[PDB]
Design a protein around this ligand. Structure first.
Ligand code: HEM
Ligand code: HEM
Ligand code: HEM
Ligand SMILES: [Fe+3]
Ligand SMILES: [Fe+3]
Ligand SMILES: [Fe+3]
Ligand SMILES: [Fe+3]
Ligand SMILES: [Fe+3]
Ligand SMILES: [Fe+3]
Ligand SMILES: [Fe+3]
Lengths: 158, 158, 158, 158, 158, 158, 158
């Protein structure tokens, strides 16, 4: 079914965001794993998978609407060296992505692509989940201090 | 994540509605139970639980959006003395709540708080369910008469 | 069965206490949950449920004794902003409620409402349990320090 | 263990009440059964059993306290001919028994027979249950009318 | 079905016997239990239940035949203070009851109430069982002596 | 929670009783075991455990009420040399303990420590159980004679 | 079998030690429990049980050897107010008991009471276990600091 061109550009832009997040989250995960912060590796890994699911959804939708998924261009990764910096970087990324999502959802509505919208609202809900988790972790770091925070990531959560 | 202030006020207003419904429905439930109308106790009870789930959702959302859930102010309960009056009171309440929900949903959309909107649409769908049930019961009372209606509430539905 | 009027007023006053505790405990629970203090969310939540059970018992008893349960008036919630302040607030509330209970129990005895008394003694025993738990948590905070206390609430207890 | 004499007289008086209720409830049960009111036979039967449990408890307690259980004297049965009259008769009996119980409980307390008291408070709680049930049935008869009430007792409750 | 009047009087007289036996056997049972004669408590208890079954059968039959079951008049209990005396008292009672049964059975036959007769013959067979048991126990007491007999009742029979 | 001082003294006095009973009952148990009176070892042992449960309850309660459990002072053990003397000694002890309990319960009531009272009433009920058992055994010894009584304690009760 | 008198005195002295440890360990356990140090309550409790097993063994042995177990005299409890002080007190007690055990074992050997010796060597092995555990805990307190040590006792070990 031929989709609205501008919806497809939004879908490709959002796909672009997911591609960045996939990599940044996966690297972060294995950095944590190397640091021995087993718990942060598990969560960040499961979030990389999450962004993969999102990418897949965009790709299928773009194809359905007869556009060309763009997996060629990769935006800026911001990696960082310590736990806080890395978490904070994931949060900034997630916030920029939520912004683009809000914009795309409004536009899809106005051209009546309600199923693209519906898909995007689900993804946004997932993003808001990641945002919640990140914000909480970052406050925990301040409230309990870095040393206690680190000790608390050593073992995986059952 | 800092939410839109006016969305938070709506969420607190809706939360306010749920708080009223929770109490009015619970009292009604146990009044029915005391009357020996076992079936009406079961349904109204399960609806009190339902409104609790709604309150919980608002509270979590307000907190997520960094507002202050207001559980302090309690609107007017209207209790009533006989079955019809009590059912009718629940229906009026549910109708005022649906009105506030319609208004909040429109507003959340226009400030792009799509996940608050999504949550609110689910809740509205639940409210419309309660409305359906209440309307039906009230017509049954007219069509079959109060005495038969009452006899029909004595045993619980399997 | 027509109960003693003053017993009913006591039951409504106690019900009043439970209504306050239900809300204060539920809000606290979800505040903790938002803070990421998973363990405190679980305990405070299970205490909100507890106070609900108490409210239900009063409501049923008032109805049985042919009084009018009052779910309309809601006393002062005191919420607070940090863990200690919130725990301490729950403790003060629980202490005022235990005071009213002691008074109601003595009175029910003197008008021979022994089953209302029996119910109230069970509830008091539950309250004393909450008091024990709160006092212990607050001392733990002093003995081990806030930072260690917080780290210790991150994971739920199996 | 030698008990207080007056406690034993109370226990025998209460036992006396149970003996009456046992018979009146059993006869009523089988009258209902004969009437084809299967549901009322089940409940009244289960209440006759209940009063038997009470009698047994008094008998064991009297023996323990070294008194002589009196199963020889039987108070006035009031049987009645139709459903309402019979239910109403059970209610009056249950009310006189609750009165004697309230009095015995106060006295046991003042001579420090706390375990006799504890037993009596449990029994009173059971009586208050029977009272609740009876009152409810009698109101149902008025609210839904005798004909509908009767139809509603034909089948047993699962 | 309207029964023969005199059959109904017999059924009420027999019912009267059962009512006496029910109480005398139950008291004896719990006296034994208090004495620590666990085995005699079990047997006498199971015989009280037995007489209850008999009473129930009479009550249902009287109602069926459209008479008025009489649970108001209670014949003489003879309780006794020691094991032998109490067993012997149960035996005398059981013997008087068998006498009335023999008489009632003959009469029911002559007015053709064969199903009342059939019921009564079953009950008589049960009574003869109790008689057998009682006689045996009483001879055991003589043959082995009271002290050995008592020791032999301490534990329940598997 | 700061308790009433005099309640705490009562709780320590009662705890004192349990401490005595624990030891006297345990020694008696193993004396019986040595005598080969397997059945008396089982019962007395299970009663020593029982008094331990009581001690534990007092200790926890005293601590809760912020007093100092006193396990230092041990009252007079009275051991005795033969079965009767030892049983009789347990009975006297149990009787003195019931006396102190009756007194403590009355006092707890008058200062409104209803949960301490509730706990104490449960314990009293247990004590009254031990008293019943002891009295029965001692009468069995008289009724069946010492030799038969002893033979009857050789095997354990299933 | 008549034992050596001096062995019996040793057994009574060792029994004396166990009696002290039983109480001191049980109180400590419930103090920890009250402090909310769930893990220390579990271990100290399981050590109180352990000392009970030891007492039982001495009591049975003394009886077997035809001496009089002495449960009347209770040595000095040293309770203490904070965790370290209490642990340290248990360690000193355990050390004095090991000393008496070493002495008793040597003596039992020289009078050829090899089975008393064998029993005592097993108990000593258990004591050495408690000593190991206590020493380790006390060093952990120094190495990780009191605050971290406390946090680490909050949850029970699976
Ligand atoms: C104020 C009067 C209220 C009464 C009398 C009441 C009563 C009850 C009762 C009896 C239960 C069942 C206990 C159980 O789950 O085992 C329950 C469950 C629950 N309540 Fe309330 N409640 C009240 C208010 C509230 C409020 C203000 C909230 C806040 C959101 C709330 C949230 C919940 C939740 C989430 C459940 C569990 C539902 C489930 O998973 O089945 N309740 N309530
Ligand atoms: C006097 C008229 C009575 C009638 C017609 C009657 C009838 C019955 C019947 C039909 C049963 C069921 C049989 C079964 O358990 O399988 C029963 C049970 C029982 N009865 Fe009676 N009864 C009478 C009086 C009494 C009295 C005076 C006592 C003395 C306490 C008593 C004590 C009991 C007890 C303890 C049970 C067993 C309850 C259970 O565990 O389910 N009954 N009765
Ligand atoms: C002082 C002489 C005592 C002796 C000889 C003794 C003996 C025993 C024995 C042999 C057991 C069974 C072990 C097991 O549970 O597997 C036991 C259990 C127990 N003891 Fe003691 N004990 C004594 C004092 C105490 C004291 C002072 C307390 C303090 C409250 C206490 C509290 C307990 C408790 C709570 C149990 C577990 C009961 C159960 O759950 O079955 N004991 N005791
Ligand atoms: Fe994504
Ligand atoms: Fe709702
Ligand atoms: Fe409460
Ligand atoms: Fe009763
Ligand atoms: Fe019979
Ligand atoms: Fe005790
Ligand atoms: Fe030891």
């Amino acid at each position: 079914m031929k989709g609205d061109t501008k919806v497809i550009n939004y879908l490709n832009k959002l796909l672009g965001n997911e591609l960045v997040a996939i990599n940044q989250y996966f690297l972060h995960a294995r950095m944590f794993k190397n640091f021995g912060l087993k718990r942060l590796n598990d969560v960040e890994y499961h979030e990389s998978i999450d962004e993969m699911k999102h990418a897949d959804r965009y790709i299928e939708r773009i194809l359905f609407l007869e556009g060309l998924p763009n997996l060629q261009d990769l935006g800026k990764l911001n990696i960082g060296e310590d736990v806080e910096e890395m978490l904070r970087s994931d949060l900034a990324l997630e916030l920029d992505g939520a912004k683009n999502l809000r914009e795309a959802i409004g536009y899809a509505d106005s051209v009546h692509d309600y199923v693209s919208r519906d898909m995007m609202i689900e993804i946004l809900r997932d993003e808001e989940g990641h945002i919640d988790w990140l914000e909480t972790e970052l406050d925990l770091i301040q409230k309990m201090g870095l040393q206690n925070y680190l000790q608390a990531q050593i073992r995986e959560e059952g």
